[PDB]
Amino acid sequence: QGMKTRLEQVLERYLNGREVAVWGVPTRRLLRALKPFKFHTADRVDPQYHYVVAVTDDDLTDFLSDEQSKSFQYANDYLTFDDEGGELPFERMCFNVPVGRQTYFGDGVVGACENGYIKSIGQFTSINGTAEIHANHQLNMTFVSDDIQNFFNEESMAVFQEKLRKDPKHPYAYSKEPMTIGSDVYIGAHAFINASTVTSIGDGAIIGSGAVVLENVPPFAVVVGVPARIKRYRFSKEMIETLLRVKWWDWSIEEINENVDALISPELFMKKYGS
Amino acid sequence: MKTRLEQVLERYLNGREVAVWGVPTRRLLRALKPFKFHTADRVDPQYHYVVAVTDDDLTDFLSDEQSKSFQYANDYLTFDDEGGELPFERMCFNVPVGRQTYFGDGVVGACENGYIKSIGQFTSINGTAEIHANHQLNMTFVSDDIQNFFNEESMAVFQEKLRKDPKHPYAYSKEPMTIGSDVYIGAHAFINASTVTSIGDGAIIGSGAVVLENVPPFAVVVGVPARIKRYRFSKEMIETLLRVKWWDWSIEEINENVDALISPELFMKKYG
Amino acid sequence: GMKTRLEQVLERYLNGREVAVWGVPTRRLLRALKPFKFHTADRVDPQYHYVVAVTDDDLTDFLSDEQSKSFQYANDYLTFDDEGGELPFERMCFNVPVGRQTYFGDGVVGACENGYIKSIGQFTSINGTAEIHANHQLNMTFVSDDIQNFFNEESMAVFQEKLRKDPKHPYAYSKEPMTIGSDVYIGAHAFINASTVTSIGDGAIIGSGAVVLENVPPFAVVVGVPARIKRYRFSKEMIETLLRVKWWDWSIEEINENVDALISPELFMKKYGS
Ligand SMILES: CN[C@@H]1[C@@H](O)[C@@H](O[C@@H]2[C@@H](O)[C@H](O[C@H]3O[C@H](CN)CC[C@H]3N)[C@@H](N)C[C@H]2N)OC[C@]1(C)O
Ligand SMILES: CN[C@@H]1[C@@H](O)[C@@H](O[C@@H]2[C@@H](O)[C@H](O[C@H]3O[C@H](CN)CC[C@H]3N)[C@@H](N)C[C@H]2N)OC[C@]1(C)O
Ligand SMILES: CN[C@@H]1[C@@H](O)[C@@H](O[C@@H]2[C@@H](O)[C@H](O[C@H]3O[C@H](CN)CC[C@H]3N)[C@@H](N)C[C@H]2N)OC[C@]1(C)O
Ligand SMILES: [Cl-]
Ligand SMILES: [Mg+2]
Ligand SMILES: [Mg+2]
């Protein structure tokens, strides 16, 4: 019966006894998510009394164009409802998928979370909204269709599903681990990652615009092309091992600011933590 | 022409009232004009046919306790899903589309633009696939909307040269393309409507492929531009498949012969 | 504030009529319509009404309706949710000049709003799925941008200072916004990198799927990932003539008087080539 929306996860932490002020045309899905909370359609809004929910990105453009929005802080005081992959200051869940802090993605990757193709997405990871993650259909039967199964009776379905589960090429991502997407990852526009054949986008990996990723991407590799190939690595092997031990992406806010100089300068990072 | 929803209601509404689940639109109210309808409150499949307006509306309906007795297509549909699969052969802007065949808004647009002659049965097209034609490449300009400034005589001269162009700008002077049955087309794939007339039965078009020429039956093509990497089956089994046309079988026949559909070795034994 | 496409068109063509809204209104639309008299469309007449279709789907509904028969595009009707749609006059898109008969989709509107685009020329055709984005910084320990939401004032200043000095222009810092020329074509799923591109030359053709990482010369055709020059549309001498003549700045009268040279490059060179 429908898991927790991003908006509900935010309102549970930040509403703080205010009323939700809906900026835009309310939808069936929004009204259901708002049932636990006091809400009304927005007119004059004040962050002391109101939490502003823009329904669509279009409504958010309008809200942020309004003089009233000046005193509203992102996430703390306002959000967009139709933004399930939007970044948040806290770790959360997108369907059954853990998502780290300040990590964002778009509708294709939200769907991949819904489909079970993703195990988790790390911290401080930036995924262009047009990136896509999908699986392969079966390639070892007479047909390649999936929706033919809407015509299968109980006995036919059983035989079909049995064969799918034994296929070592993992059609529909069967019999494989869902993919882990690391921290400090960047994925470009129109990139594609194949969920039948990829289990790992390593920490720090960069996926170029338009890349077609068919196998795992090592940590801090930069991959480009159709099919994607490793073009370079962001850092030396010694610094990659250092990054994988330090895991700055799990630091507290205090520590991130404490060490902003090492985050900004790789040379300083190596002097401090490379031992 | 008739929307997907109107085709479905003509088949299955069976004298019920349409219960609109979500905010109604101009397009929806026009599609519902010959039918009785009301905004949904309490619904029951004996009295109501539920129309979720958007995909998000459908998510909310299918999460609701009231949806348990509603069967897909027989009792509910999404209005904004012109490319959605159906258990019967339908029309998409008077493009014939086979059973259990789905595609995204780009291919819906290609149907509306006249680029597609028909789409076969059991064909799976990822929602981000695109089908577009080329502009003219043999004039001083490549713009199309410059024509909004052409008077009647200039327009006629422009239109006549486009018609004579062997490279088929805007898919002029060529057949709209046939997309076969049991076809798979992956994400961000592109098919050029100026230069493609046939995606053969059984073809597989890889994610990101840019298809500039016809794809033979059961060819697997990948790359920019798309090249044949392999065929799915031997020449002998392709000939058998193109005769048998299992994609035209009844539901009874599909279940009767599920073993041949699961196992290509058994299909060849049985039919080849 | 900045004027929507609709507001600019109404200021030009409304001519004292009343706006007849066709479709479910939005908060964006109602704000744009505040200077004007408007009502929900019922019976409409282009002598009396200017029809605003809210969505593309609303427009399809309106144009299928018998009442639309005498309505002329732009002069009498428009789609609100079509900020990159073509117009017969030069307009602004989020304070970016856009030439006549030039269209583009929501990715390029976004790039206008983000400050990535200086101007877009006349008679330019950009597929709806084209994208224009910048690079993140590539010279620090992290590639994330939204880590900066955790930066205090001191940390943010140190971060912004390095970004400003980066010669590779992360987030399009310290570079000119890009000019997109006239009579340009940009295909489906094309990508143009705003960190490293300042010019798409007049006449350029960017093929579908192309990933454009550097300037595209005038009348060059580029394809692939990354994008490379496939061919030029015309000879060097004709390119030089086209850049002199600038037919894309001609009046409607000049376009029609010279349609033979616009259709035939040979005739263009005969009339304008030295
Ligand atoms: C669902 N809506 C999202 C939309 O909200 C927005 O998401 C932004 C994303 O574009 C930003 O980042 C992008 O744009 C920045 C300039 N604004 C420069 C850095 C770039 N990666 C992230 N920092 C925050 C997301 N909420 O753009 C992508 C999208 C998919 O349209
Ligand atoms: C208009 N909405 C459609 C949306 O309903 C959906 O369409 C699905 C399509 O993704 C499914 O298939 C896809 O996803 C499956 C797991 N859910 C695995 C197989 C894969 N091809 C088809 N079986 C049915 C369509 N109606 O995804 C594409 C879309 C364009 O967003
Ligand atoms: C915001 N809506 C726009 C939508 O209006 C439409 O835009 C068309 C564009 O596709 C047309 O052109 C395209 O389609 C033509 C057949 N219709 C063939 C030529 C091709 N470049 C331009 N001539 C006019 C724009 N308003 O398609 C793209 C879009 C992004 O969906
Ligand atoms: Cl936007
Ligand atoms: Mg038969
Ligand atoms: Mg004169």
Instruction: Give the closest of A147, A156, A159 to B122, CB-based.
Output: A147
Q: How far is the CA of C255 from the centre of ligand 4 (A)?
A: 35
Domain of C228, CATH number, reads: 2.160.10.10
**Bridge partners of residue B77, in order along the sequence:** B51
Long-range own/partner contacts, residues B30-37 (CB < 8 A, 24 or more apart): B30/C61, B30/C64, B31/B3, B31/B5, B31/B6, B31/B79, B34/B6, B35/B9
Q: Is residue C109 located within the same domain as residue C226? A: yes
Residue at which a domain ends, from A46, A63, A83 = A83
Report the distance separating Cα C128 and Cα C86, nearest Å.
Answer: 12
Nearest ligand to residue A59 Cα: 4
| Contact by Cβ (8 Å): B98, B121 | yes
Kindly report the backbone phi and psi dihedral angles of residue C228, in degrees, each rounded to the nearest multiple of 5, phi listed first. -135, 155
Tokens 């840019």 correspond to B210
Point out the annotated binding site of A for Mg(2+).
Answer: 254
Atom of ligand 2 nearest to the CA of B105: 30
Taking only Cα atoms into account, the Rg of chain A, rounded to an integer number of angstroms, comes to 22
Indicate the number of domains in chain A: 3
Closest CA to B35 of B59, B11, B17: B17
| E strand segments, B79-223 | 90-92, 95-97, 116-119, 124-125, 130-132, 177-179, 184-185, 190-192, 198-199, 204-205, 210-211, 219-222
Report the distance separating Cα B130 and Cα B127, nearest Å.
Answer: 9
Report the distance separating Cα B70 and Cα A153, nearest Å.
Answer: 19
Residues 6+ apart with CB under 8 A from B198: B177, B178, B180, B214, B215
N- to C-terminal Cα distance for chain A?
51
Report the distance separating Cα B178 and Cα B199, nearest Å.
Answer: 6
- Asked whether residue C15 is assigned to any structural domain, the reply reads yes
Q: Is residue B10 located within the same domain as residue B115? A: no
Residue nearest to atom 6 of ligand 3 (CA): C128
**Bridge partners of residue B185, in order along the sequence:** B125, B205
| E strand segments, chain C | 18-22, 38-40, 49-53, 77-79, 91-93, 96-98, 117-120, 125-126, 131-133, 178-180, 185-186, 191-193, 199-200, 205-206, 211-212, 220-223, 228-232
Closest CA to A22 of A47, A5, A45: A45
Letter for the amino acid at C198?
Answer: T
* Degrees, nearest 5: CA angle B192-B195-B200: 80
Determine how many CB atoms are found less than 10 A away from the CB of residue A179. 22
Report the distance separating Cα C209 and Cα C201, nearest Å.
Answer: 19
Q: Is residue A26 located within the same domain as residue A113? A: no
Report the distance separating Cα B48 and Cα B60, nearest Å.
Answer: 17
* b/e A16-28 (16+ beta carbons within 10 angstroms → b): eebebbbbbebbb
| Contact by Cβ (8 Å): C180, C117 | yes
Closest CA to C82 of C104, C115, C99, C98: C104
Q: Is residue A46 located within the same domain as residue A117? A: no
Sign of the torsion angle spanned by Cα atoms B224, B227, B229, B233 = positive
Q: What is the pairing mode between strands C77-79 and C49-53?
A: parallel
Closest CA to A132 of C6, B128, C123, B26: B128
- Asked whether residue A141 is assigned to any structural domain, the reply reads no
Instruction: Give the closest of C61, C64, C224 to B224, CB-based.
Output: C224
Q: Is residue C128 located within the same domain as residue C221? A: yes
Tokens of B9: 């209601």
- Asked whether residue A249 is assigned to any structural domain, the reply reads yes
Determine how many CB atoms are found less than 10 A away from the CB of residue C50. 25
Residue at which a domain ends, from C60, C82, C104 = C82
* Degrees, nearest 5: CA angle C179-A191-B222: 110
Determine how many CB atoms are found less than 10 A away from the CB of residue A79. 22
Report the distance separating Cα C156 and Cα B193, nearest Å.
Answer: 50
Tokens of B149: 């400034």
Q: Is residue B242 located within the same domain as residue B201? A: no
Long-range own/partner contacts, residues C96-101 (CB < 8 A, 24 or more apart): C96/C120, C99/C123, C99/C124, C99/C182, C99/C248, C100/B149, C101/B143, C101/B145, C101/B146, C101/B148, C101/B149
- Asked whether residue C70 is assigned to any structural domain, the reply reads yes
| Contact by Cβ (8 Å): C234, C252 | no
Long-range own/partner contacts, residues C63-70 (CB < 8 A, 24 or more apart): C64/B30, C67/C43, C70/C46
- Spatial strand order of the sheet with A179-181 comes to A92-94, A97-99, A118-121, A179-181, A200-201
Letter for the amino acid at A173?
Answer: A
Closest CA to C62 of C77, C47, C81: C77
| Domain of C105, in residue numbers | 85-134+169-233
Sign of the torsion angle spanned by Cα atoms C119, C218, C211, B183 = positive
Report the distance separating Cα B23 and Cα B9, nearest Å.
Answer: 19
* Partners of residue A234 in chain C, C-beta under 8 Å: 138, 143
Determine how many CB atoms are found less than 10 A away from the CB of residue A9. 17
Return the best residue to mutate from C94, C142, C145, C195 for the ligand 1 pocket (most ligand atoms within 8 A of CB): C145
Residue at which a domain ends, from A66, A83, A100 = A83
Contact A27 B54 (CB under 8 A): yes
Q: How far is the CA of B151 from the centre of ligand 6 (A)?
A: 15
**Bridge partners of residue A192, in order along the sequence:** A132, A212
Q: Is residue C66 located within the same domain as residue C97? A: no
Experimental determination approach used: X-ray
- Asked whether residue B196 is assigned to any structural domain, the reply reads yes
Length of chain C: 274
| Contact by Cβ (8 Å): A216, A198 | yes
Q: Is residue A179 located within the same domain as residue A257? A: no
Q: What is the pairing mode between strands C49-53 and C191-193?
A: unpaired
DSSP A167: -
| Contact by Cβ (8 Å): A179, A194 | no
Contact C183 B141 (CB under 8 A): yes
Report the distance separating Cα C193 and Cα C211, nearest Å.
Answer: 8
| Contact by Cβ (8 Å): C79, C23 | no
DSSP B207: T
- Asked whether residue C45 is assigned to any structural domain, the reply reads yes
| Contact by Cβ (8 Å): B190, C189 | yes
- Asked whether residue C13 is assigned to any structural domain, the reply reads yes
* b/e C214-233 (16+ beta carbons within 10 angstroms → b): eebbbbbbbbbbbbeeeebb
| Contact by Cβ (8 Å): B9, B50 | no
Determine how many CB atoms are found less than 10 A away from the CB of residue C31. 14
Q: Is residue B127 located within the same domain as residue B75? A: no
Atom of ligand 3 nearest to the CA of C85: 26
| Contact by Cβ (8 Å): A225, A213 | no
Closest CA to B16 of B40, B50, B42: B50
Q: Among C42, C79, C101, which would you mutate to test the B interface (most chain B Cβ atoms within 10 Å of its Cβ)? A: C101
Q: Is residue A260 located within the same domain as residue A177? A: no
How far, CA to CA in Å, does C113 sit from each of A206, B206, C120? 26, 34, 13
Instruction: Give the closest of A24, A102, A234 to C147, CB-based.
Output: A102
**Three-class SS state of C258:** coil
Report the distance separating Cα A207 and Cα A92, nearest Å.
Answer: 24
- Asked whether residue A156 is assigned to any structural domain, the reply reads no
Q: Is residue C178 located within the same domain as residue C96? A: yes
| E strand segments, B107-239 | 116-119, 124-125, 130-132, 177-179, 184-185, 190-192, 198-199, 204-205, 210-211, 219-222, 227-231
Residue C166 to chain B, least CA–CA distance (Å):
33
Mark residue B116 as left, alpha or beta (left: phi above 0; alpha: psi -120 to 50; beta: remaining): beta
Atom of ligand 1 nearest to the CA of A106: 30
- Can you say how many angstroms the Cα of residue B70 is from the centroid of all Cα atoms in its chain? 25
* b/e C138-168 (16+ beta carbons within 10 angstroms → b): eebbbbbbbbbbbbeeebeeebeebbeebee
C168 in a known ligand binding site: yes
Q: How far is the CA of B35 from the centre of ligand 1 (A)?
A: 43
Q: Is residue A228 located within the same domain as residue A95? A: yes
